[PDB]
Amino acid sequence: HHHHSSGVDLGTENLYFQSLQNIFYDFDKATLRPESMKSLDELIRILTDNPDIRIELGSHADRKGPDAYNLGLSDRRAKSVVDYLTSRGIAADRLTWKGYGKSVPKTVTAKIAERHDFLKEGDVLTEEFVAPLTEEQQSVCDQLNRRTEFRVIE
Ligand code: NA
């Protein structure tokens, strides 16, 4: 099969790539911002250039509001991405998705840590981590949790 031990995955959770970005959302919205459409066009290029690969997506919500509500919101966030891709010709069978609600806070990557003096690589944006922060710091963290993650798979 593969003639080597596992290498680095092309995904948004562990590493930062200019050409494979997280999708971020407004508070209580599943809408694709103009920036999100550019990011999805970059993903469509990867899908069309590599016709056999699939994309696994995971959609999320920030700590505010009930668990069940946030699960539904995360499903709508995944669906908006799937609908944009399928509207551009991507076969639905090439995409898998899961809505995690607010159950999986994001881990701060080296790029996120470079951009914010208060965040360090490896910090997990849990409710307990975000709770004692300033209103501005909470807004940065909550925004980072309102995202869709991607991973390129077979
Ligand atoms: Na930092």
Numbering used by the authors: -19 to -1, 534 to 668
Give the authors' words.
Furthermore, sequence analysis revealed that PorE is a lipoprotein anchored in the OM through N-terminal acylation, and is composed of four domains, from N to C-terminal: a tetratricopeptide repeats domain, a five bladed β-propeller domain, a predicted carboxypeptidase regulatory domain-like fold, and an OmpA_C-like domain. In the same study, it was shown that PorE is essential for T9SS function.
The four molecules present in the asymmetric unit form a tightly packed tetramer that is predicted to be stable in solution by the PDBe PISA server (calculated buried area: 11560 Å2). However, this oligomerization state results from a crystallization artefact as Size-Exclusion Chromatography Multi-Angle Light Scattering (SEC-MALS) analysis indicated that the protein in solution is monomeric with a molecular weight of 17.7 kDa. In the PorE OmpA-like domain structure, the first β strand is missing and is fortunately replaced by extra residues encoded in the expression vector. This PG fragment interacts strongly with the protein, principally through the DAP residue, as it remained bound after the whole purification and crystallization process. Indeed, the DAP residue is deeply embedded into the cavity; the carboxylate is engaged in a bidentate salt bridge with the guanidinium NH1 and NH2 of Arg591, and forms hydrogen bonds to the main-chain amide protons of Asp542 and Asp576. The NBW of DAP is hydrogen bonded to the main-chain amide proton and the OD1 of Asp576, to the main-chain amide proton of Lys 578, and to the OD1 of Asn584.
